[PDB]
């Protein structure tokens, strides 16, 4: 068969899996896995001098150019007047039929099925890129110009694929047909185009050698349908169970919270994980430039921006303004860096809860950038933001990149005398022991001065809040210990905890 | 009956109740309350796993799809060239008649009265959302995308209803159809629309999967056709009786006044309330992007902008220019933001009084924005605007949201040494004691340089003006004490005060 | 302005800019039409300055005259704080590592990422010295072609510095 045909020509035969997660940290490998019928992936860890491992795409052989052009011809002549009907799925299963009854009397080189696959892949889908689209372990796809297609793999990082573009014309035809298929055709007049693929991936096209001098280029950004969960983050060591419990307590009470950090620090991942702590019967509105977030709540409005060059442009600013008319309980802003930040604080000021990510290493930098142009949050408004957490990518002792929350700050106010932010570090990070340090039971301005007054608690009864905090930490630990990691499983158990109560939920989980 | 039918399919029967107010606090129940003769609501005390109570709409059964198609097509074939009348009642009268003719000769799968309910519901009203609109216990309605319609119920809080939208295009059609019925169609170019349903409920639309990625979404917020009155605003603490008396005095004398603040600070609400102070026999032209102002005056031109995506588009600017030829006494502009601001001041310079809402937190910012791009009011004309009030949202000590007019400024001049506004703060606010402060006696330039001169009172009998002011404050305080809060009742009492004098008015209303 | 937007969204950036020194650079970055607000200026970490100078025979040479690390904003003056990591001694025609042992980017960015205490910073300066040693060896062996040099840098990435140094030394 086509796989074994490939698989026999290899000097050293690759093993079998179907999930390269096992290889995490394995710097040596030679494996092959399924994607679809007609698509297998052979990953081999060569000692490539420029540090790319190999990602080999295994597809059915192609009929000769002559066969195709003959099949194209005979096909084009059919359904002439006839219009290609709307629906994608039952009107794909039509092009099939027509293929059969023009192939059934043809002497073909390769087996028909394999002819079918290539005809369909190129006509109805993303052609040679389709295996990469179909592969759930790929996050970025780049065709920078002439040469190989490059990807970023979640396990392996950047890899070089076996797919190769040798001429400008192939490249052009790819960018043109895909952009047309995405209903946003490129032209020489407007050669730069952003669009969505049917699977929801985002694609950027740049068309014409006069603009992309190594040949027309594209970039596909794919998004995970299943976000990393809060128990995974705890297991990774990125947050402690107590820290996550603290966040849970705060989101349960509608606190406003920014997840901050600099390049690739994991802000969006942490944001998506802690979203599971927002009470499940509430309305969440997400507003993003890029559709990265997946919210488990049923009452979830998900909005994205649109840039048209002028008329019809919809910005984050516009969507946050509209969110004030949408009765949200939480507004989640993908990332703040412009005037939408001002509207976000006005949303906080008028009874709406907000979370967002922001690119900044520490609270001083965060406040300076929020109060500066272009965001222009007034100092008198900064107090609306209750929690700023900062995380960063660091190396561990083995040289591996890890992500860590390095500080969690409770914002109290800006000092009128000094114009400096008054805040309390709720958590800090000890890099030596690799542990999150909790400031403790007498430490939280938010618990004592905000929540206590909210939940109608007297000072004598303040320990009951710290007690529930402790119980939440216990529950999260038990989830981790029982290996409850999948985002939706974790959501289910959070919901269970809310339904039966923490004390009883802990007993239930203890006995799995 | 359609209801009794429904009950028989149930595992166990719910108790019939007059209204859900009795179920309040409780959580072990099972009830059916009546909305219309066609709408009964079944409420289930057993939560879903995500903590939503279930709100089940009991409607009469629908005709088959082919029956409905047959009816629509026949309805369309009758009358199909003629345009329907604008009057909603006459419209419905016509539709029922025509419908009665078509159905008379038909053999229906369900009773006639049921076909009629559903036809009228979908054609004239809000379709499957109509039961929610008609239930007075519904506060908010959300369709966040594909899935159920979610609501906020006055008794039960968030609930999941039995209404579902499972098809992108059907959801698009709903948003398009409802926006068209709201007199403000969405388009792909302008996919975000704020408007009001025919019943007066505010609605926000977001159109197209390219912007709302889980499907077109909407939010309905119910609330009185009766606008909040000035006596209610005093009782809320948003402004004092003296502040209202001041504004009343100023509008009596044709002063120009902007209501300023951030979004959702309550500016439109305050403008609508103080409009009741404009003398009753005057011409009012309102100019808005969507109607919010409910003017009680008889001589009221209500104009609204229009976006067509091409020819026929009419903006605030165009309407404001036309107002110069319409002999209004007051022009009320819903909000001023762009070059229409310049025309508003042209209106002032040609003898028309103007009020508007504007986005600015203080007088300094207001003047910077008026004089800068794109408004560009020349500096020497800025003092045509007499009064700016600034309103903001805040939290009190308990954490409750409140809205307060925090400053009232009289605009005197722009200082040529150099370009700073000369103004007088006639009122300010003490945020600690939550109190409004008057400047006050012999502080107002407008009282003692415009009104006194017109009157024409000497600088030593100026007490007469401040006595009329203290007088108006007492009358307003009296209305609050006697709980005269309804907008139109307050209007009547104001007109009554005009038509027998303050002294006689205070003394009257003291009795009740 | 968009280059700074790119830094603020987690993309690294390099660029050339026509300016003689950090003061001029910052005036131009913060002024019209670039208009980067001061609070974002320190997204740019390093500014290097290079000039055409005359040699003693009156021919043109190019020299890096300063390398500046951009730190943050001074709370008293509202000015951009920077420290020179390198300066140029025109009389000896030598680059001075003025930031040696006191570089902000080395201690507060690099060292922190590596979890290296303020008291073990010497390890980073050791690694730097080995990098320099390697670059000298390439020069000594007349490895000048851009692609040959690129190959050796990659060889150093692979294999590691110490034995790349051994291989080059031969
Ligand atoms: N806690 C973590 N542990 C390990 N990897 C992570 C963690 N958080 C994020 N990542 C990975 O790091 C990269 C950047 O994550 P992202 O959430 O997009 O960061 P940012 O939002 O700060 O740009 C992604 O590849 C993501 O899968
Ligand atoms: N003084 C007030 N007190 C309490 N609620 C108010 C007040 N003014 C307005 N609101 C409510 O606040 C919300 C925003 O009001 P609106 O007048 O539309 O503000 P803006 O015009 O500034 O956007 C509305 O739901 C309205 O009912
Ligand atoms: Mg308004
Ligand atoms: Mg990011």
């Amino acid at each position: 068969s086509f796989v074994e045909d490939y698989l026999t020509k290899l000097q050293e035969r690759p093993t079998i899996i179907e999930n390269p997660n096992i290889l995490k940290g394995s710097k040596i490998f030679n494996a092959i896995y399924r994607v679809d019928d007609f698509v297998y992936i052979h990953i081999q860890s060569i000692k490539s001098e420029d540090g790319y491992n190999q990602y080999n795409v295994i597809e059915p052989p192609r009929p000769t150019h002559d066969e195709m052009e003959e099949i194209e011809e005979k096909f084009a002549l059919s359904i002439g007047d006839k219009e290609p009907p709307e629906d994608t799925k039952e009107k794909e299963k039509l092009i099939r039929s027509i293929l059969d009854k023009i192939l059934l009397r043809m002497r073909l080189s390769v087996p028909k099925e394999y002819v079918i696959y290539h005809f369909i892949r190129d006509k109805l889908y993303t052609g040679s890129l389709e295996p990469l689209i179909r592969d759930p372990y790929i996050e970025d796809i780049s065709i920078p110009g002439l040469g190989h297609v490059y990807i970023v793999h979640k396990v392996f990082g950047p890899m070089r694929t076996s797919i190769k573009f040798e001429n400008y014309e192939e490249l052009d035809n790819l960018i043109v047909s895909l952009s047309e298929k995405s209903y946003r055709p490129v032209s020489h007049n407007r050669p730069v185009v952003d669009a969505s693929l049917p699977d929801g991936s985002r694609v950027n096209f740049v068309y014409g050698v006069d603009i992309s001098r190594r040949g027309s280029n594209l970039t596909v950004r794919k998004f995970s349908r299943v976000p990393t969960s809060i128990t995974q983050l705890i297991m990774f060591g990125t947050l402690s169970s107590m820290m996550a419990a603290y966040i849970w307590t705060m989101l349960d009470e509608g606190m406003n919270l920014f997840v901050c950090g600099e390049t690739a620090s994991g802000k969006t991942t942490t944001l998506n994980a802690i979203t599971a702590f927002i009470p499940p019967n509430l309305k969440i509105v997400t507003i993003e430039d890029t559709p990265e977030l997946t919210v488990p709540h049923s009452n979830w409005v998900a909005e994205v921006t649109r840039e048209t060059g002028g008329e019809g442009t919809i910005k984050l600013f516009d969507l946050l303004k509209a969110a004030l008319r949408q009765r949200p309980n939480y507004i989640l802003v993908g990332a703040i860096r412009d005037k939408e930040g001002n509207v976000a604080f006005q949303a906080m000021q008028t009874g709406h809860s907000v979370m967002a990510t922001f690119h900044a290493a520490n609270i001083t930098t965060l406040i300076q950038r929020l109060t500066g142009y272009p965001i222009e949050v007034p100092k008198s408004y900064i107090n609306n933001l209750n929690i700023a957490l900062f995380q960063t990518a660091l190396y561990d002792k083995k040289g591996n990149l890890i992500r860590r929350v390095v500080e969690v700050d409770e914002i109290i106010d800006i000092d009128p005398v000094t114009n400096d932010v008054v805040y309390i570090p709720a958590f800090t990070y000890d890099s030596v022991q690799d542990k999150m340090l909790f400031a403790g039971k007498g430490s939280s301005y938010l618990i004592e001065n905000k929540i206590a007054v909210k939940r109608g608690i007297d000072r004598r009864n303040i320990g009951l809040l710290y007690d529930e905090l402790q119980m939440r930490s216990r529950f999260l630990n038990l989830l981790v210990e029982k290996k409850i990691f999948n985002y939706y499983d974790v959501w289910d158990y959070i919901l269970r905890a809310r339904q039966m109560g923490l004390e009883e939920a802990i007993k239930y989980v203890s006995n799995i």
Side-chain angles (χ1 to χ4, degrees), chain A:
Chain A
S1 82
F2 89 92
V3 181
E4 289 285 350
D5 261 282
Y6 175 83
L7 218 55
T8 326
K9 82 168 175 49
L10 288 330
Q11 176 50 233
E12 168 73 4
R13 189 172 165 285
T15 168
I16 302 253
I17 44 186
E18 40 181 293
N19 187 345
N21 264 343
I22 169 73
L23 281 330
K24 70 201 166 198
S26 299
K27 270 121 175 55
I28 44 110
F29 57 87
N30 188 16
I32 164 179
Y33 68 86
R34 70 174 300 269
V35 167
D36 286 6
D37 296 38
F38 323 104
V39 176
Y40 283 80
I41 303 301
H42 175 207
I43 45 197
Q44 193 171 8
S45 66
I46 67 176
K47 292 212 304 171
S48 167
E49 56 290 327
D50 63 343
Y52 282 112
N53 286 318
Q54 284 190 332
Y55 177 98
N56 299 301
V57 177
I58 302 148
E59 287 179 289
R62 306 253 296 172
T64 200
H65 193 260
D66 180 90
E67 292 161 283
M68 272 310 179
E69 184 187 333
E70 178 163 328
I71 292 149
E72 295 180 356
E73 167 213 286
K74 266 165 151 201
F75 179 83
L77 297 205
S78 181
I79 78 159
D81 52 71
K82 188 189 308 170
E83 47 185 45
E86 280 73 38
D87 169 281
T88 40
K89 95 176 64 180
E90 103 293 55
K91 292 140 184 220
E92 173 198 311
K93 194 64 191 66
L94 160 61
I95 334 285
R96 303 254 157 198
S97 176
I98 310 181
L99 251 191
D100 290 17
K101 80 203 195 221
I102 84 170
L103 291 176
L104 222 151
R105 206 60 51 73
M106 302 190 78
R107 193 54 206 175
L108 263 342
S109 50
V110 300
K112 245 75 152 184
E113 299 75 32
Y114 302 87
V115 189
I116 270 82
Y117 165 77
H118 282 303
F119 180 85
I120 304 311
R121 195 198 69 176
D122 299 8
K123 192 145 176 57
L124 239 289
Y125 300 87
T126 65
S128 64
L129 293 188
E130 195 59 29
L132 305 174
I133 289 304
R134 294 289 201 163
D135 191 335
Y137 303 93
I138 293 170
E139 85 190 24
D140 298 341
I141 299 158
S142 298
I143 313 170
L146 296 177
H148 292 259
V149 183
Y150 290 93
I151 59 163
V152 173
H153 196 277
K154 285 189 80 84
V155 183
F156 304 111
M159 305 183 88
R160 169 175 290 116
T161 80
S162 60
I163 306 171
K164 207 175 187 295
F165 291 84
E166 308 264 21
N167 68 87
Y168 290 136
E169 302 78 24
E170 264 171 347
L171 236 12
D172 282 348
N173 293 334
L174 187 64
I175 274 80
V176 169
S177 58
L178 289 176
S179 61
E180 290 180 349
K181 278 171 192 162
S182 303
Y183 300 102
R184 299 271 180 279
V186 298
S187 61
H188 287 298
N189 274 327
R190 31 190 290 327
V192 178
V193 157
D194 290 298
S196 301
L197 297 178
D199 71 333
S201 303
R202 288 295 184 91
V203 56
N204 171 267
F205 307 99
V206 178
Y207 173 56
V209 189
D210 64 329
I211 303 295
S212 183
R213 55 175 173 108
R214 304 191 46 237
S216 302
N217 77 84
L218 82 261
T219 309
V220 187
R221 306 175 278 167
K222 301 172 71 193
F223 311 95
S224 38
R225 44 167 217 110
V226 179
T228 303
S229 75
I230 192 57
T231 59
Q232 292 176 295
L233 295 187
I234 295 170
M235 181 244 102
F236 295 165
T238 300
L239 296 83
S240 63
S241 170
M242 191 66 58
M243 178 182 289
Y246 169 97
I247 297 172
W248 186 359
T249 300
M250 298 296 168
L251 296 189
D252 208 52
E253 292 296 335
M255 298 289 118
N256 305 309
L257 148 4
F258 280 6
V259 183
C260 311
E262 297 179 304
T263 293
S265 53
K267 303 181 284 297
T268 292
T269 298
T270 287
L271 177 60
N272 206 152
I274 62 175
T275 295
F277 291 139
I278 297 161
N281 66 337
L282 301 182
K283 186 170 193 183
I284 288 77
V285 173
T286 59
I287 290 160
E288 298 174 280
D289 273 322
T290 301
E292 297 172 293
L293 295 171
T294 301
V295 170
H297 304 61
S298 299
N299 194 7
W300 171 30
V301 169
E303 293 163 351
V304 294
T305 53
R306 186 177 66 196
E307 198 188 278
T308 69
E311 185 76 336
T313 293
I314 298 301
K315 295 159 138 22
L316 292 176
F317 181 78
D318 299 309
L319 302 171
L320 208 2
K321 279 235 59 202
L324 301 172
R325 284 88 169 161
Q326 291 173 327
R327 297 286 190 211
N329 294 101
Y330 260 93
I331 301 167
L332 307 202
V333 191
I336 288 170
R337 77 159 188 286
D338 209 282
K339 301 171 199 63
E340 76 282 349
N342 184 281
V343 183
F345 279 74
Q346 184 68 20
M348 291 177 228
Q349 188 56 79
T350 52
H352 309 91
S353 302
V354 172
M355 291 198 286
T357 77
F358 196 93
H359 185 112
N362 53 59
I363 194 175
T364 302
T365 298
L366 172 65
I367 301 312
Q368 280 177 8
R369 288 176 181 175
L370 287 178
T371 61
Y373 200 80
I375 304 179
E376 306 195 280
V377 181
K379 302 184 308 171
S380 73
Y381 271 74
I382 285 301
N383 78 264
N384 283 287
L385 176 60
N386 306 116
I387 294 156
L389 83 69
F390 297 90
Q391 61 181 81
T392 189
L394 302 165
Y395 297 106
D396 62 27
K397 274 70 202 165
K398 288 164 44 188
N400 303 120
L401 202 67
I402 59 178
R403 271 121 184 133
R404 289 298 184 263
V405 175
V406 297
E407 186 159 336
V408 181
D409 291 317
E410 306 190 348
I411 294 170
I412 295 176
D413 218 332
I414 301 295
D415 173 275
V417 195
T418 57
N419 282 327
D420 288 9
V421 62
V422 177
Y423 69 100
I424 292 172
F427 290 88
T428 57
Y429 175 68
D430 167 30
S431 57
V432 169
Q433 286 299 92
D434 194 26
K435 295 186 302 224
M436 305 297 166
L437 303 175
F438 186 25
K441 168 161 185 152
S443 65
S444 191
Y445 159 82
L446 294 176
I447 289 165
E448 294 170 16
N449 296 67
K450 218 72 156 152
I451 297 169
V453 181
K454 186 170 173 124
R455 287 188 63 162
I457 320 294
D458 184 20
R459 287 201 189 99
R460 313 195 307 273
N461 302 62
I462 204 51
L464 288 86
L465 290 181
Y466 285 93
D467 286 327
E468 187 175 9
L469 189 105
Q470 191 67 34
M471 279 205 292
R472 291 181 157 128
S473 182
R474 291 184 63 213
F475 184 68
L476 297 174
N477 272 334
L478 270 48
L479 249 45
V480 170
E481 291 170 6
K482 302 298 179 178
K483 296 193 167 40
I484 297 156
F485 290 132
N486 169 278
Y487 195 87
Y488 296 103
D489 286 339
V490 169
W491 169 247
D492 293 347
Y493 281 94
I494 293 170
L495 295 208
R496 167 177 300 271
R498 296 181 172 280
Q499 222 191 3
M500 61 182 47
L502 227 35
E503 182 113 28
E504 285 292 314
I506 285 168
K507 294 175 183 189
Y508 183 87
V509 179
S510 295
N511 280 290
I512 295 191

